[PDB]
Amino acid sequence: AAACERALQYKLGDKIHGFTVNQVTSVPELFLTAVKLTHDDTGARYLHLAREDTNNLFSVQFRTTPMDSTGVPHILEHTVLCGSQKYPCRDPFFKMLNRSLSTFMNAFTASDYTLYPFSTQNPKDFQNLLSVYLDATFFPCLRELDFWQEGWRLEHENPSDPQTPLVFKGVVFNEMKGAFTDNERIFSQHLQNRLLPDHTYSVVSGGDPLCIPELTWEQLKQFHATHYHPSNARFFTYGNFPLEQHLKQIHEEALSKFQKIEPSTVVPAQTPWDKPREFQITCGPDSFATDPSKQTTVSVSFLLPDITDTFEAFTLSLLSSLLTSGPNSPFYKALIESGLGTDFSPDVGYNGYTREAYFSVGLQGIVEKDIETVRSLIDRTIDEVVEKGFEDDRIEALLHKIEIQMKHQSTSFGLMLTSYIASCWNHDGDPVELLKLGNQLAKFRQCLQENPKFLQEKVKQYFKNNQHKLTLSMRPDDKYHEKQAQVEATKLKQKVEALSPGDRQQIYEKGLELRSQQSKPQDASCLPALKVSDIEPTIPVTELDVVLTAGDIPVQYCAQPTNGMVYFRAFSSLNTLPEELRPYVPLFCSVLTKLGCGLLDYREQAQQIELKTGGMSASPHVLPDDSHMDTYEQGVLFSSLCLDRNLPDMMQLWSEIFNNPCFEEEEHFKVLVKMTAQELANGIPDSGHLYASIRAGRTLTPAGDLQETFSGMDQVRLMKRIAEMTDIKPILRKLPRIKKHLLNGDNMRCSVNATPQQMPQTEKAVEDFLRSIGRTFKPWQMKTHFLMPFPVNYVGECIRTVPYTDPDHASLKILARLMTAKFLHTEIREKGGAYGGGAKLSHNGIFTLYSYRDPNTIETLQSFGKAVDWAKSGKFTQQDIDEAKLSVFSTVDAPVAPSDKGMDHFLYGLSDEMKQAHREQLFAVSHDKLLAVSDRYLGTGKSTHGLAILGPENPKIAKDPSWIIR
Structure with a gap:
């Protein structure tokens, strides 16, 4: 009945669809049995990890050992997802992203190998994605114009005017521009290059912007024919789905069409230095x-x-x-x-x-x-x-x-x-x-x-x-990037001067055909797809029991197969806190468990935390109510984790933190604040769209204002200001003031996730811990520009819509995902040139439009206006609504680990009844309801807008009196 029991039946030497069982090992600490197979004719290696986990994953691995800094495996990795022989349609990967019930679908290119993994929970969806992945990696149409789009090309500053000079364009080209604006990537790259300077680790595998235009289409085709051959491949699967179906698909679709080669791709050993x-x-x-x-x-x-x-x-x-x-x-x-x-x-x-x-x-x-x-x-x-x-x-x-x-x-x-x-x-x-x-x-x-x-x-x-x-x-060096501009412009002029006018007209004509390729809406009906009939109508109910203890604290126990792990959480409200101390609450949460407690100094406290628990953390959370836009819950989540046997020690640690935290350790505190501030300054680009969407939504709901206070740019600016203070004592005096309002049991609730066999002892330890502790807004429009020294922009627009329990909310979620899949993706990414761009709908009711690494600004908001006009226009088919329902149900039914099942009831207070009601509203959403909600809320002038932009200077914005620059 189990997966590893039938998987242990594979005997050595068994022949299954051209594969041979070479090794079967039981791994009891991971509850899995590993099976190693090799294809006899081709030599492809297969490792299958059979474990009773419904989230099945496939991955295929190719050894790519570059010998120059052209970036050929990275551009080839981008190019193989643009079309294959059986599926000649444009962009199979992203199209299957909206025709599947996957939870993850991406690809990775390491320094010396490329990896293509996906995971899903539906076996038919698994067969479909397996066919698309095998076909994409092994038989791509490697069209030259797709290589010009994804890699590098010569293009005019205005692609329709052949008299303006030619400049470099390309996706990977700007990926590597952004790779070498990052100082950490320069440091990491040069470190790896200098330490192993003999072979493939000595080059910039991602592509050196000055060495990238040396790659030709023929070199890319030869690289694909040499490295993306099944004799140079490793196949890997994990999960409970029958192995035989996978082997039958691999053999009948890919491996049968090739014959054995010998990859000359082994990386030799670095010869040891004699001197540092x-x-x-x-x-x-x-x-x-x-x-x-x-x-x-x-x-x-x-x-x-x-x-x-x-x-x-x-x-x-x-x-x-x-x-x-x-x-x-x-x-x-x-x-x-x-x-x-x-x-x-x-x-x-x-x-x-x-x-x-x-x-x-x-x-x-x-x-x-x-x-x-x-x-x-x-x-x-x-x-x-x-x-x-x-x-x-x-x-x-x-x-x-x-x-x-x-x-x-x-x-x-x-x-x-x-x-x-x-x-x-x-x-x-x-x-x-x-x-x-x-x-x-x-x-x-x-x-x-x-x-x-x-x-x-x-x-x-x-x-x-x-x-x-x-x-x-x-x-x-203060003049580094001008040197960089000089050398790239020098290679640019060196390559542009040798072009003949016939060559330039060929470039111009290819540019116009490329722009048409980026513009004409094409058909993707040759890809396989799931139907709405394969989505489960009801979810299996999650069992909870709340026990009031000592003498009025509600405690939620959820018996789960956590494999001997206990996860304890506590959420304490902030409603009694004076408003002056709100901005320092993230700081309070970030240092509370790192300063010492009782008789333990910070070194001993850190030793105890690492020796008894799996980590103890605090973080501020703003939880909006689901039935009122102007009602919200504010609080701090204490979360910890421990093995079953170390639970009383963990609860003793929590009691000592709650009763005697060491707010006097000043020297280690200065270290922690400067480190947190540095980390916040380093993380702005990767979460730029998050900070922009949070800033745009500050003025729409009280919850939005508090979310800006707790986790917006206000927190980064505050952390920098605190990190520049020479005398940290007035900040340190604020921590006992917050401590006396937070660390008590007046407005508290707890959660416990553990195995049922551990539950009574856990109930005792928690009940022992609880006895040991003390006892109308009108939105208004705002435009904000953060003048940041960035090479790309981050734009956010927020629109105020209905909350979760409103019947229009499910329709809005479908509309948001529809707009993202069929308009904003093509316009902002392929046409606009941004790395990421779309629309999202939050639980509180904020409809947020976002852009990630967008070279434009005004055109982004204008495309948002053309997108809402498109949504009101109704120019979408019933199959597009089917794809939106599929993607939403691929998102809301994502697997939840035993440690967060169920977290939504504990945090947001959504019952299984409420989730089933919203699920039946997602089933009942129709085309006319999508038109109704598009004319009622997203239209211009019907609701309040909010805008925020992180990015470089824009002179036109500076001359706009309706903008505030920060």
Whole structure:
């Protein structure tokens, strides 16, 4: 009845559709049985992980070893998703994204391999996506004009005017422009290139913008014919679906059409250096920093063995975690608390993506005069670790942390396994040996108990006696990007001058045909698709029981197969808090569990947290009510995790944090605030559309204003202001004031997710913890421009609509997904040139339009206006509504892990009755209701708009009196 029981029936030497069973291993700590097959005729390798998890995942892996910095596997990865032989239609990937019930569908290109994974829960959907993926990777139409669109091409500044000069355009070209505006990517790339300068790791695999136009269409076709051959492929599947169906599809669709080749693609070993080296590089000065003399980053890197010998890599990874993770690590005490820098260097710790892994440590944010100081600190610190070793409590904490990651149940487990074995498997390693974590832990414990200086000899061998050291420093130059502009313009002129007028007319005519390709709406009916009849009408009910305890705290217990894990959550309201202290509540949540409690200093507190729990965190949440736009819930979520046996210790930790938090530890507090502020400044681009949509919605609902206070740009500006204060004491006095309003049991509710066998002891520990603790808005329009020194823009427009329980809400959600799939995607992405762009509908009722990395600004809002006119126009078919329903049900029915089932009832108070009502409204939504809601809410002048833009200077915006610039 189970998956691993039938999977254990595969005997060695069995022939199944051209494959041969080579190895079957039971992995009891992961509740799975691994099966390794190879195709006899082609030599393709297959690893199947059978586990009773309904979220089945497929992935295929190709070894791509580039020998130049042209970016050929990255552009080829983009090009294979544009069309294949059996499905000649345009863009099969994104079209199947709206014709499937997938939960994830993407592709990855690492430094030396490319990986194409997908996951879904429906077996027919699995067969459909498997056919589209096999066909996309192995038989693409590799049309040259698609290569001109996705890769690089010459194009006029106005594509219709052949007398303006030609400039470079391309998707990957601007991807690499954005790769080398990032200082961290320059540092990481140059570090990897300098440490392994012999072979494929010495080049920029993503593409050097000055070396990208050397790639021709014929070179791309040869690269595809050489590397995307099934003899150079690794196939991987995970889940409970029958293996035989997969093998029948793989054989009958792809592998039968090829014959055996011998890939000459093995990456040779790096020859060890005789002497350490130093290199100096330069980057672009960051504008978020305020001091220019404190912008130097320095690192020291060590070469470690190969990933093939699994054991030694596991050992050195544990050693690297012991050396750099947490305030009890030697390097934290030596570097962070020295006050020389601001944070660790990039790629800090163990980096096992290359063939030979490497260790890195260093600082960023130092003054250039302190480079030799840092190098001496690292040398002296290594000497102290050699002489003193590690204490046993930290080793136990590390082994307990790895045990927790082994037992924890995620929703994307198969994705974690394929990413965790891809690197070892890529270099002819045994992927099954990485799965047996219990065996390696046992051997590690034995190796420590037999030799007390085991870790001391390992740090000695790989740090004190390893001559393969790389010291690399990076300091910015104020004129770097003008040099960059000069060299790209020089290659531009060098390539444009050699073109004849007939060549230029060929470029112009291809440009007009390309623009038509980007404009003409095409048919995608040759792709397979699911119907609404395959969507389940009702969901299985989730069982809860609320027990009032001690003497009025509601506690929600949900029996779940969590595999010996207990997840405890508590949510405390903020309704009694004075309004002056609201903006410092994220800071309060971010430092509360890191400063010490009772008789424990911050080092001992961090040791206890890492030794007993899986992590304890606090974060502010604003939970809107579902039936009133002007009603909301504000609060703080305390969340923790522990193994079954360490539960009373965890609740004792929570009691000590609730009754005696250490608000007097000032030195470590200054470190934490400067680190949090630096992290917030580094994360602006990846969440730029999030910050823009949150700013645009501040003036529409009270909940929006509070969400801007807790997590908007206000929080970043506040964190920077606090991080620039020289005297931190007036900020530190605010923390007891918040503590006396939050850490009590007056307005509290709790949740527990655990196995039913553990439940009475858990009920006792929580009931023991609860006894141990103390006892009309009118929206108005606003336009905001953050003048940011960015090369791309982030635009957000918010529209006020109905809440969740309103019958029009489900129709609005369908309309939002419809507009995203059939208008905004083509216009903003293909035509506009943005990396991401669409429309979303939130639970509170804010209809948000967003753009991500958009080179335009005014045209984006104008395309939003043309999009709402399109939605009112009704120019969409019934099949488009079917695709929108499919995508929405692909989103709302995404799998939930045992640790958050059910979280919606605990946080937002939506019952199963409410979810079923909204599900039947999503079923009953029709074309006329979509027209009705489009003319009632999204139309111009019917509701209040809000706009916000993060991006570079726009002179026309500066002359607009209706805009406020911040």
